[PDB]
Amino acid sequence: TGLSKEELLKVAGSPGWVRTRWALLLLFWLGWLGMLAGAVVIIVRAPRCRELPAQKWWHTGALYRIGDLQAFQGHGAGNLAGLKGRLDYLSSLKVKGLVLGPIHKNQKDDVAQTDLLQIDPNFGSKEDFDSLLQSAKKKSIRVILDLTPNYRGENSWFSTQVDTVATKVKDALEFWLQAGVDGFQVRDIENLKDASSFLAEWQNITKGFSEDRLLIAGTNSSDLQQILSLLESNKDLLLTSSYLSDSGSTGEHTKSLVTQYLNATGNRWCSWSLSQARLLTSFLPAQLLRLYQLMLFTLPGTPVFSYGDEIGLDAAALPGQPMEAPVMLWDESSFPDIPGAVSANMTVKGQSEDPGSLLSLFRRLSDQRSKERSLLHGDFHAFSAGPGLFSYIRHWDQNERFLVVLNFGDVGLSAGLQASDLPASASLPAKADLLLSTQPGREEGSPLELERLKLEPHEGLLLRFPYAA
Template sequence: MSQDTEVDMKEVELNELEPEKQPMNAASGAAVAPVMAGGAEKNGLVKNKVADDEAEVASKFTGLSKEELLKVASSPGWVRTRWALLLLFWLGWLGMLAGAVVIIVRAPRCRELPAQSWWHKGALYRIGDLQAFLGSDAGNLAGLNGRVDYLSSLKVKGIVLGPIHKNLKDDVSGTNLEQVDPTLGSKEDFDSLLQSARKKSIRVILDLTPNYRGQNSWFHPSQIDTVTAKVKNALSFWLQAGVDGFQVRDVENLANASAFLAEWQNITKNFSEDRLLIAGTESSNLQHILSLLEFANDLLVTSSYLSDPNLTGERVKFLVTQYLNFTDSHWCSWSLSQAKLLTSSVPAYLLRLYQLLLFTLPASASLPARVDLLLSTQTGREEGASLELEHLKLEPHEGLLLRFPYVP
């Protein structure tokens, strides 16, 4: 027996001893016999498995080549599809643009905001009695000058000062509207106050009520010509000095008050459009109040229109509605008094109710619980607009004019 025959016999024996090593897909020994008989290939089964793997790889999807894609993309069907999608895109975009333009054009236009002056935008602080405000020892203009920083901390737009002019009780000849009362200081003290206030962006409004220490604030009716001439001269004098506005009170005692107020307002407006004139009256008659506004468009009026303590809720509603209807878009105002404190005309248990009413009216309001407050706004103000009053520490004698910002 040759050496090769011995090797083949060993392999046959090995296959018989280890049948578990036979291929699982072999049905019988006949599948192996040709290989054994040939003697030239001993690992045919491995060769068949590799061939199967190669066939499986060959059968996987490989996609289109670049050339094939370009060929398909250039076909008429795809070209028409792309043009149709592009056209739909631009039509949709133009449609949305046209819709937006239509909405903008047809939408209701916002009302133009009215022109606002400085007194419409902030608080005015009223100081009627310097000695009550500062104390008897420092109740003068120099003492007030030292409190400008305090006023600035309250973020006020201006102060309504006085009257501070020289006035001998019920004596026209002894009343000089252009001279500071010597007990309160001098013209130089007033000029220094103006400069200090201007540095803090605080405006100064001067009260020129002539006979503020007498029984009739405008003296005897027979002296009206002399008094009004003094007022006209004083307006020009103090405007030149740098005052930003004026206040006159008790105009119900002034004959032909509306004409005089219109004349005085013309003087202030001709000097500068940002000058303010305030008129106060104790009258609660609506016709009288409206007559004061007849010739003065930008006049601010304080009155006793709502001062009746016996008013019912329905009556208050009627008065408020009536006032708003008659004043229309005029810069109107609400108050219980031109100068008195709220506690002097309203019972204590109604104070908060009146405060709530005056704070939410769509116009100006004057209220103090222990101080004078004048709240102003344009008709149409949002009711219930919040006010930041927590930082205001006011004494019983102090006064404050507050103005709501305009809300369209």
């Protein structure tokens, strides 16, 4: 239904149509070269990516400390081959680490009968130790070993001839690195003479072996200045401390203890922890435990928990047991010495089922901290969001941005966030997706109006929100 070959060539071969056809050909082809130049302009004018920082394993989420292998298990099973069994739990916690409270052969207060190299036979054999350590490698749980020498005694470095004790450690670190451990914790460095110098030597020995091993020192200190002094000469030492411990016991000081410390250290890496050893519940009253798990999982740095923090274990709740090493409550059998005292909700089995439980919050947060590039190594901006609220935004370059809102005071807010004076790079949205709340009865997943939000007393929120160029 048109011109034949004959009819077309008798018309469309005219010089006017030839010039028109040439024009349309070159118009199209310069149009495509124009659209290429347009795209090459956009690709140069576009904001370049921000260099992603090379991160050691301990940046990627929580360590986990096991101060007594016996207390973590119940007796008889209290040995390293027992512990090899439990790693599936730890893998459930998404803990990127472990720290086995000292296993070396220490005789109480005896400098000479103590060895930091031979393991105390109660816990097994080096053949067990390696069996564990190899299993943990297989399951992506690095293992640190705690080498604080006189750990069965009163003073953990002994009272005397400290240079011989330092010499024991200097030898020990080499041996156990050769055995394959992922680094070392030492404790009580306030009871060690010339502490900063020995940390410098031991740190050099560790990093000198491999770049992906760490030394966690730990102090009973809560003085900002003493802490900053141990951290002056040593720059990639985690130093766990009592510094966040003195919280005011309705959280009231925390916005300030946290943001001073970040400011003072110059936003280096940190280890957030309420102590060098004892549980969260040694310090926090139980209305805050949820609120601190939301915070320890989302400040810049590697959080550290003792065992059973994830279930809000408490030494006082099952009377008589020592505040050093309370028996871990796996199921209702786990403390048979006063049977029927353990409620279901106090135990791992009893929490594991319930989305509202503490361990269901720990598990969930541990996920976010270990996957999300924003919590993994984002920047941090505190801001004044509200009267009680410790509030801050974690952000990376262009990834998802996370606003954390902790209501530390005992009075609910009824009038929204009202952020004064946000950094211009990090401005709050009109709305943001509630990724979780510390409290039940919230529409998790849904977007919230920040100017008309309502926190309850001690309700923390984790909101997630997308980028804007």
